[PDB]
Amino acid sequence: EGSDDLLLKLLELLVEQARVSAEFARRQGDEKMLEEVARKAEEVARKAEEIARKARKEGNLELALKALEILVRAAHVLAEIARERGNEELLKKAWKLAKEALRQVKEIAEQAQKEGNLELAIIALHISVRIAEVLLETRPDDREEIRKQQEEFEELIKRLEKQV
Amino acid sequence: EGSDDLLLKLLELLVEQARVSAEFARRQGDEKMLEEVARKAEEVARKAEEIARKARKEGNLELALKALEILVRAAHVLAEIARERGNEELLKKAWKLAKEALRQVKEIAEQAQKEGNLELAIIALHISVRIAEVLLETRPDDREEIRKQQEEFEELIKRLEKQV
Amino acid sequence: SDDLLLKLLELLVEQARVSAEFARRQGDEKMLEEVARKAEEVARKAEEIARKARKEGNLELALKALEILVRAAHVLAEIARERGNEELLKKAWKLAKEALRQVKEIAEQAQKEGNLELAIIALHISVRIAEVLLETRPDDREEIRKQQEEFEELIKRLEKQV
């Protein structure tokens, strides 16, 4: 929908602005602004999850991956803010978002690969790469969640290789 | 204008090459190359600024935003060169370029939504976030200029949210 | 087609960089060796596609494959420089050297023929190669000089042709 594509573009801008605003707040020792920026990233991740959920349910796999790319970017910014704050609760929140994204991206990737949409499955696998980067930043000692991305990536890329 | 579009692509290449050339010049202790790269980045910023003004005059807002993106990238490269060589005056010139780009981006961003062109208003806000990053690298203690960018960002994006 | 295969090789390059970070975190030197070999394999397949695409005169496709060859060499250099592995840092330098020779040739051909868009893409890859040369052989003043003369001489020609 034209309304949801516009909303996702604005959500991405809020994520970019939150990243720079957190850098300034960290330099100033403004922990209150750091908490407001963190809540901004959480709010964007919540809305992006909404859109990806409705899009995947209504069959729009392309809109779902656009919303998931923003969800992952918001979780990455939230993990950065958690590092700036030295706050493990914010780090746990970003890790939960990365898990939610990995499960949805995996489902969309299998759906696109089953239907033979190679480009859509490639875009999904690209987001799962960015998800693994967030997992490394948040909880790198949870080898189960990281191996799950590596297995789902390895099992699918070999299938896509056969169809080319 | 296809000619001005290709010209900006060439200016984009000169900025990217200036960035890497500055890294080598710093490694070899070649202050002669470090000075040549710095003014090369300055000449690109002025040329991108000229194209931006002419594009804005002709009513081509998309071309003006492409030129300003080059101007900001040139200012960032200048800031990286300056903070490397420890030159406060080169940092000041890069700050000045960022402040001028911010003023032009804010004008285009309102003119874009005044014509109902939400996509160009979104691109302008993208550039303003890149400008805020340059302000962080040049004068982080100029709290008024960054607060000015955040207020303009919030005011405009809230207007665009009302169109979803 | 070669377009879809290149998109797959690029995905393998992205996963290799993240898999190498986890391998270093876990201290698995055997996994680091496997990731480096997969990056080396992607670089070789990209060079194959570049040579084929150039033989048919499909310069657009050749530059897409050379872009991936440079990204593969860039990932290799990061693994080598992080581990301090001088051996892998030399193999990445050889891939960058090979890419710059092919990129410069396509950049000259495109500029002579007037394909301004393809010449710009080639010059963009040349900048990415100079970055890899910084990571692998920073003290080699000559290769970077030649990259800089080739770059500025080709830019000047394109400014006139635009």
The secondary structure of chain C as a DSSP string is -HHHHHHHHHHHHHHHHHHHHHHHHHT-HHHHHHHHHHHHHHHHHHHHHHHHHHHTT-HHHHHHHHHHHHHHHHHHHHHHHHHT-HHHHHHHHHHHHHHHHHHHHHHHHHHHHT-HHHHHHHHHHHHHHHHHHHHH-TT-HHHHHHHHHHHHHHHHHHHHH-
Concatenate the DSSP letters of all residues of B16-85 into one string. HHHHHHHHHHHHHT-HHHHHHHHHHHHHHHHHHHHHHHHHHHTT-HHHHHHHHHHHHHHHHHHHHHHHHH
Rounded to 5°, angle at Cα C145 from C144 and C151: 85
Q: C117: exposed, middle or buried (C-beta count within 10 Å: 0-12, 13-18, 19+)?
A: exposed
**Residue A10 forms contact with B (CB below 8 Å):** yes
Resolution of the experimental structure, in angstroms:
2.1
Residue A157 to residue C12, Cβ atoms within 8 A: yes
Q: Is A141 exposed, middle or buried (0-12, 13-18, 19+ CB in 10 A)?
A: exposed
Residue type, B145: E
Which residue on chain C is closest to B25 by alpha carbon?
C141
Contacts of A28 in chain B (CB under 8 A): 143
- Cβ of residue B23 closer than 8 Å to a chain C Cβ: yes
What distance in Å separates residue B16's CA from the closest CA in chain C? 7
Other residues' Cβ atoms within 10 Å of the Cβ of residue A8 = 22
Q: Please indicate if any CB of chain C lies within 8 Å of the CB of A133.
A: yes
The whole-angstrom separation of Cα C138 and Cα C144 is: 9
A140 in contact with chain C, both atoms CB, cutoff 8 A: yes
- Of B115, B12, B14, the C-alpha closest to B69 is B12
What does DSSP assign to residue A41? Answer: H
d(CA B76, CA B68): 12
Chain C interface, mutation test: which of B7, B17, B70, most C Cβ atoms within 10 Å? B17
- The residue extents of the domains of chain A are 2-162
Whether chain B has a CB inside 8 Å of the CB on C123: the answer is yes
Q: Which of A49, A144, A47, A58 is nearest to A104 (CA)?
A: A49
